[PDB]
Structure formats: structure tokens, C-alpha cells
Amino acid sequence: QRRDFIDIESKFALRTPEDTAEDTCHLIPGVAESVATCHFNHSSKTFMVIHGWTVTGMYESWVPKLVAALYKREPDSNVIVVDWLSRAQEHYPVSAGYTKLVGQDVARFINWMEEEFNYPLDNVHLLGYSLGAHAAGIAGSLTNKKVNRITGLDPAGPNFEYAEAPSRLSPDDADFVDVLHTFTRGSPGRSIGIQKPVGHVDIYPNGGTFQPGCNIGEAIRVIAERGLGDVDQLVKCSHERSIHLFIDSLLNEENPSKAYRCSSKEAFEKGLCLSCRKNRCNNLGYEINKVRAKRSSKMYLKTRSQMPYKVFHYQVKIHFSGTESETHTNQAFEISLYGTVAESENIPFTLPEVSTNKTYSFLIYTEVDIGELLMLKLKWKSDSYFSWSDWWSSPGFAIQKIRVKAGETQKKVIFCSREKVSHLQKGKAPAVFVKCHDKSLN
Amino acid sequence: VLLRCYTCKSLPRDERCDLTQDCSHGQTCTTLIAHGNTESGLLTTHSTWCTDSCQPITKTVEGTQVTMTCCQSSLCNVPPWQS
Numbered sequence: 001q002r003r004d005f006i007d008i009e010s011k012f013a014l015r016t017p018e019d020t021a022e023d024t025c026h027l028i029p030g031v032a033e034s035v036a037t038c039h040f041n042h043s044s045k046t047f048m049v050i051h052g053w054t055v056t057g058m059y060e061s062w063v064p065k066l067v068a069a070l071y072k073r074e075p076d077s078n079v080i081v082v083d084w085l086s087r088a089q090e091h092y093p094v095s096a097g098y099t100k101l102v103g104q105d106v107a108r109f110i111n112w113m114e115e116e117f118n119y120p121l122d123n124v125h126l127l128g129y130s131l132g133a134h135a136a137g138i139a140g141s142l143t144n145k146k147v148n149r150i151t152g153l154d155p156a157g158p159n160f161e162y163a164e165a166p167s168r169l170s171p172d173d174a175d176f177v178d179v180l181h182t183f184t185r186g187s188p189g190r191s192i193g194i195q196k197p198v199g200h201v202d203i204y205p206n207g208g209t210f211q212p213g214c215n216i217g218e219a220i221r222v223i224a225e226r227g228l229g230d231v232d233q234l235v236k237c238s239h240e241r242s243i244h245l246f247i248d249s250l251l252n253e254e255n256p257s258k259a260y261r262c263s264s265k266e267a268f269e270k271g272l273c274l275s276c277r278k279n280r281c282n283n284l285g286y287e288i289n290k291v292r293a294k295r296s297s298k299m300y301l302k303t304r305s306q307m308p309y310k311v312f313h314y315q316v317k318i319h320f321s322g323t324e325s326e327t328h329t330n331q332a333f334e335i336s337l338y339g340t341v342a343e344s345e346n347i348p349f350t351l352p353e354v355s356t357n358k359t360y361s362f363l364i365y366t367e368v369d370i371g372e373l374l375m376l377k378l379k380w381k382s383d384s385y386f387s388w389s390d391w392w393s394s395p396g397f398a399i400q401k402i403r404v405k406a407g408e409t410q411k412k413v414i415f416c417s418r419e420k421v422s423h424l425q426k427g428k429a430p431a432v433f434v435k436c437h438d439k440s441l442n
Numbered sequence: 443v444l445l446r447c448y449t450c451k452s453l454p455r456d457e458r459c460d461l462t463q464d465c466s467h468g469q470t471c472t473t474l475i476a477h478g479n480t481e482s483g484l485l486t487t488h489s490t491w492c493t494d495s496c497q498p499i500t501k502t503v504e505g506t507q508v509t510m511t512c513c514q515s516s517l518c519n520v521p522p523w524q525s
């Protein structure tokens with residue numbers, strides 16, 4: 001009873017679908033009557049929201065948002081919010097130390113629920129943010145039986161990057177460990193988000209370095225000079241995005257964002273990783289396919305700056321044919337996609353090298369659901385004031401076909417020029433291609 | 443019942459498809475027809491293949507008439523002007 005638990009500093013609130021922002025009702029370890037007082041549903045599943053580091057000692061804005069979304073998606077479940085705000089309000093390496101103690105508090109609470117009520121641990125889902133992802137990992141590594149799932153939302157990097165599996169979140173901590181890495185910018189062990197994979201599935205939205213809508217782009221950054229600093233770091237925008245990406249997945253059960261297994265972010269940004277064969281793709285978030293692999297699998301995707309975050313990924317392959325040998329560096333282009341449903345015109349992209357009789361693959365992504373692709377317009381951009389003139393000599397290539405592979409629908413589409421060849425000439429009119437083949441990759 | 447379809451890429455109006463491929467089970471015959479003005483004046487083209495998901499449509503993308511047709515008979519996907 002209660003006597004064997006008073007050393008537990010952590011508090012456990014059973015938040016409700018109608019009372020999301022406040023810790024009204026508490027589940028007191030060793031006091032079985034408190035479980036009935038809070039109206040825990042012994043029939044339903046349990047989510048344990050474990051916060052991270054705080055300089056204020058108050059729950060952040062995301063806590064009611066996450067609780068509210070779990071109750072929208074799972075209205076009969078139990079959403080427990082873990083309070084470790086005192087310990088999470090110390091100097092960072094000290095709070096990092098307390099993840100061992102919080103991990104222990106949580107495990108003892110979980111083990112109590114099982115001993116006292118014979119509640120199944122296979123019905124437990126741990127969601128940990130920042131240091132809380134490691135507190136969740138330690139908790140999972142100390143329960144009598146394995147918990148069903150652990151979601152790591154941008155797990156803390158400093159003092160964890162080089163920590164061994166028992167001191168941080170690792171795949172042995174639960175039956176399934178999924179991890180979103182959203183702010184990994186910086187040197188290894190010096191990033192705010194952990195860089196190394198720590199789950200069965202490790203998703204790196206937009207490469208995981210920083211999030212769209214969160215950073216100050218390099219151009220703005222150079223112009224601002226000595227004034228501006230790392231606002232993203234301070235404001236915690238990219239870091240917190242993992243919570244919003246997860247929330248999005250709970251509110252859009254029918255249309256999840258897909259992640260793609262890949263060797264590197266650089267390879268992904270060339271459009272080389274867009275397959276769904278042998279679990280090479282998965283759904284970001286709640287609706288994840290619980291595929292536990294032999295090796296840690298790193299997965300990539302692009303997203304929008306705001307909710308709903310889903311974008312459509314396309315790999316575009318072009319063979320730049322020509323009569324005379326020419327090589328152009330850092331060339332800017334615009335691609336326009338015309339489908340059955342909608343269209344997205346003037347999508348920019350650049351190529352580091354454009355050379356005669358060579359093929360180049362690149363990623364094109366768009367918020368627009370264009371439907372089934374019909375037409376493709378390609379523009380080779382010039383910034384010269386004379387590009388309009390027919391007197392102005394500009395380089396050009398003869399392009400016959402454009403091969404496109406759509407990631408979401410897993411379809412290979414060939415587009416071919418209306419005439420024998422489409423002339424793509426720098427600064428001139430766009431080259432037009434119309435669909436001439438389809439292929440479902442399945 | 444397994445289908446044989448005509449499989450040709452962006453052929454000009456006055457040219458008939460020679461190529462024929464045996465479709466995978468569940469697949470249908472399709473014809474895409476583009477018709478609009480180009481640098482070499484007005485042009486009509488036709489492409490034909492075995493498709494999985496077949497949706498008949500008629501849209502005028504960037505001033506070019508695109509028509510998609512489906513049929514379940516063997517070697518049926520022949521453009522209107524060639525049937």
C-alpha cells in the first residue's frame with residue numbers, strides 16, 4: 001500500500017476528453033480507490049504523456065493539444081499526463097540525470113496498475129517528448145512485462161547521443177519504438193534532438209535538421225547580420241513540431257503522411273528513395289505499421305509548414321539530349337504538373353550540373369492533390385535581361401521523354417514530347433510533355 | 443479473361459499502332475488522345491497501353507484537349523479515327 005510509494009516524486013493525472021488542460025484527477029500509486037475516483041476505464045487502452053525539459057516548471061501549450069487529439073482519435077481510452085516538472089526544471093545535465101528516477105517512478109506506477117488491477121501492459125502506449133522520451137525508455141526497460149509501444153518525440157540529444165541503451169530510449173524498451181527526429185541541426189552530441197536512430201522506426205521529417213516554417217532561411221540570415229540569432233533554438237519551433245506532426249496523424253486517421261526508408265537525406269533529396277516494397281515505406285504517426293527490423297531503419301519525408309502537413313512526393317528523371325557537348329552548373333528550372341483533379345504550376349528546383357547526354361533524378365513535392373498526372377511543363381530559367389530576344393543565343397537541349405514516379409500511389413508514368421523532341425532552351429518558352437504510359441508498382 | 447492491348451507511345455494522328463502486349467490479370471485497355479496547337483501548327487497524338495485503374499476523362503489542360511478512354515475487349519484501344 002501507499003507507504004511503499006511515497007518516495008515517488010512524480011504525479012500521474014488522468015486527464016479527460018472534457019478536462020484536457022488541467023491535472024484535476026490524480027492516480028495515487030498505492031491508493032487503489034484513487035483509480036475509481038478518476039474513472040479509469042479498465043476495458044480501454046492507456047496513453048502516458050511524459051513531458052521534457054522546462055525552464056518555467058509549467059506544462060507547455062502542446063500538452064492540452066496532444067491530450068485533446070488522443071481523445072478525439074481514441075474516445076474511450078485513458079490519457080495519463082505524468083508530472084515531473086520540479087525535476088524537469090533544473091540545470092539541463094541535472095534534469096538529464098533525473099530521467100533515471102522519472103523512468104523508475106513511471107515503471108513502478110505501471111507495475112502497480114498490473115499487480116493491483118491485472119491491467120495488461122500490452123494496452124500501454126508511452127509518448128515521451130524531449131527528456132521524456134528517455135524517461136519513457138528507462139520506464140519501459142524497468143516494467144515486469146514489455147509495454148506495447150513507445151513514441152519518441154524529438155528525443156533529447158545532449159548527454160544521450162553517446163549514452164548506452166539502458167540510460168536512454170532504445171528499441172529493447174518496448175514491443176515497438178517509433179521515433180520522430182525534427183531538430184537534429186548541429187554537431188553530434190551537440191544537437192537538441194538526438195541524431196542516431198533509437199527505435200525500430202526512426203522518421204526524419206525534412207531530413208530532421210529543422211522544420212519548414214521554423215528556421216530563418218540562409219538568405220534572410222546573411223542579410224540580418226550580427227543582429228539575429230538562432231530564434232528556432234530559443235523558440236523551440238522545430239523541436240516541438242514532432243508533437244504537432246503526431247497530433248496531425250491522430251486527427252487525419254484516413255490520410256497519413258508516408259515516410260520512405262533511405263540510405264541518406266542527400267539520397268532522398270535526389271528522389272532515389274520512393275519505394276513501398278519490403279516495408280521500405282511507412283505511415284508517420286499513430287497509424288504506423290509496427291515493423292520491427294533487424295537493423296535501425298532511417299526514414300525520410302517532406303512536409304508543409306502548417307497543419308495538415310501532408311505533401312505528395314515525385315521522383316523526376318530527365319535525359320538531357322543534345323548535339324554539341326556543353327556543361328552548365330547550378331541551373332534553375334521550373335516544373336508545372338497538370339493532373340485530372342488539380343495542378344501545381346511553377347514549382348522551382350535547381351540542378352548542380354546539367355550536361356549533354358546525361359540523366360538526372362530529382363525530388364519534386366507538392367501540397368496540391370493534382371490527381372492522375374496528364375501534362376508536364378518544363379522551363380529552363382534565365383536571369384538575363386536579354387533572354388526574351390530571338391537574337392540572344394541561349395543553350396538548349398532536346399528532351400524526348402520525362403519519367404515520373406509518384407510515391408503515394410506507387411505509379412511510374414512516362415511523359416513524352418508532343419513533337420519528335422521538345423526543345424528546352426534557357427530563358428525561353430516551356431517544353432510540353434503529355435502522358436504516354438502508366439505502371440502500378442504495387 | 444486475359445486481354446491483349448495495343449501498346450504505343452505518343453503516335454501522330456496518321457499512324458496505326460503495331461505493338462501489342464498481353465496484359466496482367468485485372469488490367470484494361472486504355473487510349474490517351476492529345477489535341478492542340480504546337481510550334482509545328484495543330485497536332486493530334488495517341489498513346490495506348492494496359493492500365494490497372496482506368497478512369498475515362500476529357501479535360502482541356504493548358505489549351506490541349508486530353509481524352510482518356512477505356513475498353514475491356516482485346517485490341518479495342520484504337521483511336522476513334524482508326525476504328
Ligand SMILES: N#Cc1cc(-c2ccc3c(c2)Oc2ccccc2C=C3C(=O)NCCN2CCOCC2)ccc1O
Binds near residue numbers: 052054130156192193
Ligand atoms: N525542451 C528542451 C531541451 C532543452 C535542452 C537544453 C537546455 C539547456 C541547456 C542545454 C540544452 O544544453 C546543454 C547540454 C549539455 C550540458 C549543458 C547544457 C546547458 C544548457 C544551458 O545552460 N542552457 C541555457 C539555459 N539554462 C537554464 C537553467 O539554468 C542554466 C541555464 C536540451 C534538450 C532538450 O530537449
Ligand SMILES: N#Cc1cc(-c2ccc3c(c2)Oc2ccccc2C=C3C(=O)NCCN2CCOCC2)ccc1O
Binds near residue numbers: 055233234235236
Ligand atoms: N541563464 C539563463 C536564462 C534562461 C532563460 C530561458 C528562457 C527561455 C527558454 C530557455 C531559457 O530554455 C531554453 C534553453 C535552450 C534552448 C531553448 C530553450 C527554451 C526556452 C523557452 O521557454 N522557449 C520557448 C519560448 N516561448 C515560445 C512559444 O511562445 C512563448 C515563448 C531565461 C532567463 C535566463 O536568465
Ligand SMILES: *[C@@H]1O[C@H](CO)[C@@H](O)[C@H](O)[C@H]1NC(C)=O
Binds near residue numbers: 041043044076
Ligand atoms: C469503456 O470503454 C468501452 C470501449 O472499449 C466503452 O464501450 C465503455 O462504455 C467504457 N466504459 C466506461 C466505464 O467508461
Ligand SMILES: *[C@@H]1O[C@H](CO)[C@@H](O)[C@H](O)[C@H]1NC(C)=O
Binds near residue numbers: 321324326
Ligand atoms: C548525344 O547522343 C546523340 C545520339 O543519341 C548524338 O547524335 C549526339 O552527338 C550525342 N551528343 C554528344 C555531345 O556526343
Ligand SMILES: [Ca+2]
Binds near residue numbers: 138141165
Ligand atoms: Ca533503453
